[PDB]
Design a protein around this ligand. Sequence first.
Ligand SMILES: [Mg+2]
Ligand SMILES: [Mg+2]
Ligand SMILES: [Mg+2]
Ligand SMILES: [Mg+2]
Ligand SMILES: [Mg+2]
Ligand SMILES: [Mg+2]
Ligand SMILES: [Mg+2]
Ligand SMILES: [Mg+2]
Ligand SMILES: [Mg+2]
Ligand SMILES: [Mg+2]
Ligand SMILES: [Mg+2]
Ligand SMILES: [Mg+2]
Ligand SMILES: [Mg+2]
Ligand SMILES: [Mg+2]
Ligand SMILES: [Mg+2]
Ligand SMILES: [Mg+2]
Ligand SMILES: [Mg+2]
Ligand SMILES: [Mg+2]
Ligand SMILES: [Mg+2]
Ligand SMILES: [Mg+2]
Ligand SMILES: [Mg+2]
Ligand SMILES: [Mg+2]
Ligand SMILES: [Mg+2]
Ligand SMILES: [Mg+2]
Ligand SMILES: [Mg+2]
Ligand SMILES: [Mg+2]
Ligand SMILES: [Mg+2]
Ligand SMILES: [Mg+2]
Ligand SMILES: [Mg+2]
Ligand SMILES: [Mg+2]
Ligand SMILES: [Mg+2]
Ligand SMILES: [Mg+2]
Ligand SMILES: [Mg+2]
Ligand SMILES: [Mg+2]
Ligand SMILES: [Mg+2]
Ligand SMILES: [Mg+2]
Ligand SMILES: [Mg+2]
Ligand SMILES: [Mg+2]
Ligand SMILES: [Mg+2]
Ligand SMILES: [Mg+2]
Ligand SMILES: [Mg+2]
Lengths: 36, 151, 146
Amino acid sequence: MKRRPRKWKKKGRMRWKWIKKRIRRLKRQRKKERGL
Amino acid sequence: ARMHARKRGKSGSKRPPRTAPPIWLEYTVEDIENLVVKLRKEGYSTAMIGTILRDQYGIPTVKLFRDPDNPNRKLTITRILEKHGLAPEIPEDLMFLIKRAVNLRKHLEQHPKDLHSMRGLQLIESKIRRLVKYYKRKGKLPKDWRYDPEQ
Amino acid sequence: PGKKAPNGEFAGRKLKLKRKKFRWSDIRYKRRVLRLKEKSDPLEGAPQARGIVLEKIAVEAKQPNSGMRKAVRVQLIKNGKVVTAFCPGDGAIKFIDEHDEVIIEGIGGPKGGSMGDIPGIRYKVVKVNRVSLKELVKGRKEKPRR
RNA sequence: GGUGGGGUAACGGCCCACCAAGCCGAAGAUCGGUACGGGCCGUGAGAGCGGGAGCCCGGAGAUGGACACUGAGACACGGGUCC
RNA sequence: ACGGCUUUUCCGGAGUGUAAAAAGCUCCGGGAAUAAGGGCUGGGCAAGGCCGGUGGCAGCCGCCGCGGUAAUACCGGCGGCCCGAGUGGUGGCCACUAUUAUUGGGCCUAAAGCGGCCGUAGCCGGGCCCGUAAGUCCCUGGCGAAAUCCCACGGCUCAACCGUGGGGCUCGCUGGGGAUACUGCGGGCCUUGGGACCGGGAGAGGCCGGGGGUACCCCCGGGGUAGGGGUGAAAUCCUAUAAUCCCGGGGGGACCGCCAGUGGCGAAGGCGCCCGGCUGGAACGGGUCCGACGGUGAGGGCCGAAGGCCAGGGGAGCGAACCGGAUUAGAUACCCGGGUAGUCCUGGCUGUAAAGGAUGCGGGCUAGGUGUCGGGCGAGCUUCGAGCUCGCCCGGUGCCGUAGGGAAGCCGUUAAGCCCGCCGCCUGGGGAGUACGGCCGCAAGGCUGAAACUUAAAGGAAUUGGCGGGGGAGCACUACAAGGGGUGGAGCGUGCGGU
RNA sequence: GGCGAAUACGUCCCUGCUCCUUGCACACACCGCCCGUCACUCCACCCGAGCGGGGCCUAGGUGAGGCCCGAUCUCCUUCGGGAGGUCGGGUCGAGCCUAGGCUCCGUGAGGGGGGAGAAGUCGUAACAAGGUAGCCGUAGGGGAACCUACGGCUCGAUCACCUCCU
RNA sequence: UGGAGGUGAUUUAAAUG
RNA sequence: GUCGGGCUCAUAACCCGAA
Ligand SMILES: [Mg+2]
Ligand SMILES: [Mg+2]
Ligand SMILES: [Mg+2]
Ligand SMILES: [Mg+2]
Ligand SMILES: [Mg+2]
Ligand SMILES: [Mg+2]
Ligand SMILES: [Mg+2]
Ligand SMILES: [Mg+2]
Ligand SMILES: [Mg+2]
Ligand SMILES: [Mg+2]
Ligand SMILES: [Mg+2]
Ligand SMILES: [Mg+2]
Ligand SMILES: [Mg+2]
Ligand SMILES: [Mg+2]
Ligand SMILES: [Mg+2]
Ligand SMILES: [Mg+2]
Ligand SMILES: [Mg+2]
Ligand SMILES: [Mg+2]
Ligand SMILES: [Mg+2]
Ligand SMILES: [Mg+2]
Ligand SMILES: [Mg+2]
Ligand SMILES: [Mg+2]
Ligand SMILES: [Mg+2]
Ligand SMILES: [Mg+2]
Ligand SMILES: [Mg+2]
Ligand SMILES: [Mg+2]
Ligand SMILES: [Mg+2]
Ligand SMILES: [Mg+2]
Ligand SMILES: [Mg+2]
Ligand SMILES: [Mg+2]
Ligand SMILES: [Mg+2]
Ligand SMILES: [Mg+2]
Ligand SMILES: [Mg+2]
Ligand SMILES: [Mg+2]
Ligand SMILES: [Mg+2]
Ligand SMILES: [Mg+2]
Ligand SMILES: [Mg+2]
Ligand SMILES: [Mg+2]
Ligand SMILES: [Mg+2]
Ligand SMILES: [Mg+2]
Ligand SMILES: [Mg+2]
């Protein structure tokens, strides 16, 4: 992924590391269904 | 700055501005040419000959005399050697760099994991290719000349 | 960052390419040249449009205001798309009926869009059965055919 | 691209026979998008940015796609043929 | 309100006008008669702190904002302001906007310097002499239709419009003549930038072989006997098959304490026990050599912490997942007892970090002061040491600070200052580093990267307070500590809630 | 008015207040601010079995019509020939048919996140040392915010000691 | 006077408006 | 589990009594 260091700031949002983990989890599901 | 390491060292020679040889120098041009030929026949580089002439014979550079043949130019060690047929076939700086690259390559055949020394070989070969471009432009190397380590 | 480049006398081509490259970072220029607004406009570039009323509704104002804003759902004659339009004035919603034809135009907010405490509505009613709505709300004129 | 012809009012791969491997391209070919070109017009202190219906000059078309007769001139908006 | 005047315009006529008519124009009779609207009125922004309705309902609002029964902001009356035969609404282009920047913008902390480096094209390139005349400058021939634009004069009553002259416009092309400062091209001559070489030194730079240091875990033998370990407090766990602890031996895998220093070396990532071998780069000293051989660098190439993957080894200590003991309302955790992968070696793949100096690289210039590391020079000491002290030059590495810069924090010859270059990147916040398409990878993943729609701020530096399960100082029987007497249980007096 | 003691001569541990300094995403001022899953309402979008239809390149069959060279026939001639019919051959060609591949619009069972709304729900992750400092890369685990391991950054509070400076 | 770094530590539980 | 009282600005947790 590309770097957006502004996203790492905490005021009014959840932690970016875990947002990234959630996005990657979602992308795995789409790629599996694309194979069927 | 240095071509690759970007350091700003300043050490070097500080030549005074003068036209004629000094009064205390007694050697003539013929003696100087004879000395240059003798030293070259003993097997020295062009840089080494000038060092010996300065240190032992009290001769500040041969570039203080006019060329007896061509009045348009001053004398240099390479010009003197050319006048007698003992001039290097390959320019000396290129030759020294190529010699350094050959020794380093056989070290790397026995030490494949020495990566820091390998970057040094890469930098040396960059210098060699810069020089070959310049010398082909000037006509001091044939147009078909190529540098290949496997040679 | 050093001096802005290229400055050379014979570097015209690179300077022109640099200016062309970074002009696509301007959203105004990109939208106009790619014609993005035309691609998605239900009014198809027109300043006004005609439609038929399908139902009356009410939209809540946004915080921290309170009130109900009266609007209509309109199906446009030219392409059949359905859009929401505001009815300006005190008591204006009483002059509208289902199956009536209206003329609508932009509501006039920033960037050619919505305004005020009612985001989501981009249009307003100007005429009802070919009579000016402003007159009807004030008087001076009567809505025909009952 | 070359050599030898044909055809045309006329030069030409414009089209043929024969002989070669050429020709264009990251300084953007090819393909895709949009559009008739210019004199000019709107705006701005200027540098610029945007447009090119109306008048003049050039181009193209006559429901769509093909093709002929007469004539100095047309493959013809108020002339001919086929789909 | 009186008295008077006029007739552009209006009504009715004659002439002229016209192909014929109509307009227009000259005259005659009548008469102030026939003629004002649209928007706005809280700020921006000119104009009301008046009256009557409505009461977070209805409504207004480009933006900021009004309206919750005493509305200068909504609806209406009366006033007032702007423009005026016009005046308002909606959509588009230019300006606003130095929010596209040649003139003329930004990238430490706000959007933004590729994790690092090498190099191809391109762009930018040191001094002197001679030649040329492509670029460039000057003069003059042939062209760039008219209309459109600017100026003076003239014709319609003036004007708009139209004519006669002067200029501009299509900034573009072409035939000749002249100049040689700069750029380009050709020849010659240099040493300052850069490179080569020689000398005595410095350094955890890299690779390979050998020799060690304690510490720790397991095993065998001797001693001794009831506990050890661990927490805020405990428990699981270990121990009579003799633990914890002490002594004598054997085996194993990882790691190199103190000295150690805003110290050293390297492009960055990174590099610290000793001895030997191979090897990279830099500083200083230099009347040595070559002779502009240079800077940056689209594409392209190489290096690149930890973790992960593929094969084969190894496994002391630690320890994702997991298994137990606790804590708690719950506790999928924090704490405690165990524990697989992994952490280590050999051959490959992956190419990612707050890979941060959050600061791309080369060159010139612009006060000082004071530490420290390497080399050189001078002077003085000296136990004669590769020793010590002071001063100066060059190159690294810190701090304070003048001019200047900046929103400020701060930077300030190790620039974030003034100037000459080249490359990369940014253009309000979100949607989104997502969807679709492509390339690369065994896989995990990497590089490239929109739109519909949503929103008035998001973001930065600094100020005053308030607060902290932050620090310091001080104080009070409506605080404690030391004490004396009680209230809370019963019946009743009295006040409060509810019923 | 009568009678008439006990204990301390201190401390900031508890409950609180004043002042200096420090951190702060708070100013309605910690009774502050604030995050995610599940549930409900609305808007735009993505993947998509099936499902009607359009447009381009190919390869093959067919082909109205045009041109050229031939043989013969009918009618006119000024004897040059000129109108036209039938057949043979060559060649050019719009259209049409079949199949193949891409491309586009329309519906579409089911699946997926995004944005508003206002609160139905469970917890309290971030801001003070936010009560286990926060955050980046990679990997595993969990209703949900999140937790844990290795390497890194300060954009981390407090006390003691040490080092380096002005 | 004022600054920059390093190593050690931090005695239960305490959610919400 | 029910009901009542404490503690808190208040709710949850927590403490006490009772049937
Ligand atoms: Mg010919
Ligand atoms: Mg067109
Ligand atoms: Mg055009
Ligand atoms: Mg027209
Ligand atoms: Mg028609
Ligand atoms: Mg005013
Ligand atoms: Mg308005
Ligand atoms: Mg009122
Ligand atoms: Mg009013
Ligand atoms: Mg700016
Ligand atoms: Mg930034
Ligand atoms: Mg960088
Ligand atoms: Mg380079
Ligand atoms: Mg020069
Ligand atoms: Mg010239
Ligand atoms: Mg003209
Ligand atoms: Mg006149
Ligand atoms: Mg005039
Ligand atoms: Mg005129
Ligand atoms: Mg024993
Ligand atoms: Mg590159
Ligand atoms: Mg263990
Ligand atoms: Mg680092
Ligand atoms: Mg840092
Ligand atoms: Mg960076
Ligand atoms: Mg020294
Ligand atoms: Mg260094
Ligand atoms: Mg220095
Ligand atoms: Mg300073
Ligand atoms: Mg943006
Ligand atoms: Mg993809
Ligand atoms: Mg009390
Ligand atoms: Mg007490
Ligand atoms: Mg009682
Ligand atoms: Mg605030
Ligand atoms: Mg709270
Ligand atoms: Mg918390
Ligand atoms: Mg906690
Ligand atoms: Mg925490
Ligand atoms: Mg876990
Ligand atoms: Mg309670």
